[PDB]
């Protein structure tokens, strides 16, 4: 059963957390609080290169968001059937996890400047994101990204949608097909029950977490 | 004969070259010097998410600095040759970038700043890398960081050692089996080749190249 380092927050984590949920693998969480527990985990060499998140799986100390994730993937039909595929998908990734991190970064900009971000995450989605993939599911019909089935695409893109929409409720407006691979993609079973109470998913941050990580490092 | 979108300087689209040179590839360029030269790769839909890199390659437009190479590397023989190495190989990449970044930051930085940074290159590149990489090589004798062939994570690492030692001579000094390691590396042909003159290769940002960048985005 995996075990997973970092913070309790979402964080870079949150995405393995996705994943894991969604391929239906339940897991361990150890949580960091302070400095000092960071450097025990640093200390005893668990993290290859001193950073979080690593998580403990198959025997091996994972580190790095993509890295991890791929591995995942790789373990559980989420990376494609093909090379094609598999291109595709890791595109996708990347480039919605650039999306993304304006939703990681946030929280530590400086309040006045958090304004400006939301907009700006508005932007880019409603501009260079949501329309490469509302047409590309206009385009073939399926209910996936790729391959017509559950890829590291539609989860990356789904933890990402949702993210937006918790701060930019109707930025799916214009992406009638957005809404609908949501919503389905929602109903999936693990992601059903992930985004139901008592999941790992962990909450939009606070004013707490913020303060722990920066305790922390 | 794969395509590069870019900029005429190193910036992100580097490691594509070193990649494709190393694996014998060769390409052609084509660079970005204006707005409107950028506009018209965005308007003619050739930019899957409106940035560079691009590359065409195999008849797609592949976009993502990691995406891409991932790509080469798969049609290559640089990504291991089974789940266990390519996923050190991937790890090793990830966490090599994190370092490069500080590179490619760098001359975007504020003169004033941009001393400090050399200062915490050399930091991190001594403490929280060099060292990873040179304990591995010293436990298993290889020329190699993986599968004792060629790989993804050597050129990398070749790529921005050879870049920290442009800005700080001496980094390698306590680090003798990387010093060899750096050494054969560049021993390899398209490697030696690529490295010596009239090579796509590209030198490190002046003045002109940073204007440059700042005009086009
Ligand atoms: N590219 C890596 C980087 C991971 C990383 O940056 N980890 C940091 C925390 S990022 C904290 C952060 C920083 C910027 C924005 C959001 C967030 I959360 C860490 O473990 N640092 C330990 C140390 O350096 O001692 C990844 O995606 O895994
Ligand atoms: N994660 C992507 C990002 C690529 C990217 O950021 N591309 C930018 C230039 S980065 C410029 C930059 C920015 C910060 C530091 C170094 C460098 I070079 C681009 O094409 N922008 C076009 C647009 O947005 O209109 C990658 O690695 O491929």
């Known amino acids: ?37 960071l ?3 640093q200390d005893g060499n668990h993290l ?8 403990e799986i198959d025997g091996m100390k994972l580190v790095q968001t993509r890295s991890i994730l791929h591995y995942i993937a790789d373990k ?19 480039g919605t996890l650039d999306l993304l991190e304006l939703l990681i970064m946030h929280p530590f900009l400086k309040p006045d400047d958090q304004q400006k971000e939301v907009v700006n995450m508005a932007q880019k989605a409603i501009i260079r994101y949501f329309p490469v993939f509302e047409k590309i599911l206009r385009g073939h019909g399926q209910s996936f990204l790729v391959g017509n089935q559950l890829s590291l695409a539609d989860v990356i893109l789904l933890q ?30 693990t992601i059903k029950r992930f985004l139901e109470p008592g999941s790992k998913k962990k909450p939009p941050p606070d004013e707490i977490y913020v303060r722990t990580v920066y305790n922390i490092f």
């Open 76 to 94: 559980h039909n989420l990376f494609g059937k093909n090379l094609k595929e598999r291109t595709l998908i890791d595109m996708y990734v990347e």
């Open 160 to 189: 990402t949608i949702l993210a937006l929409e918790e701060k930019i409720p109707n930025i799916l407006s214009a992406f009638p097909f957005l809404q609908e691979y949501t919503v389905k993609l929602s109903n999936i079973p």
């Open 1 to 37: 059963r995996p075990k997973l380092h970092y913070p309790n927050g979402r964080g870079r984590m949150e995405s393995v957390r996705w994943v894991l949920a969604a391929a239906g693998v339940e897991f361990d969480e150890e949580f960091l609080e302070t400095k000092e527990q």
């Open 39 to 41: 450097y025990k985990l």
């Open 48 to 55: 290859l290169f001193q950073q979080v998140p690593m998580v």
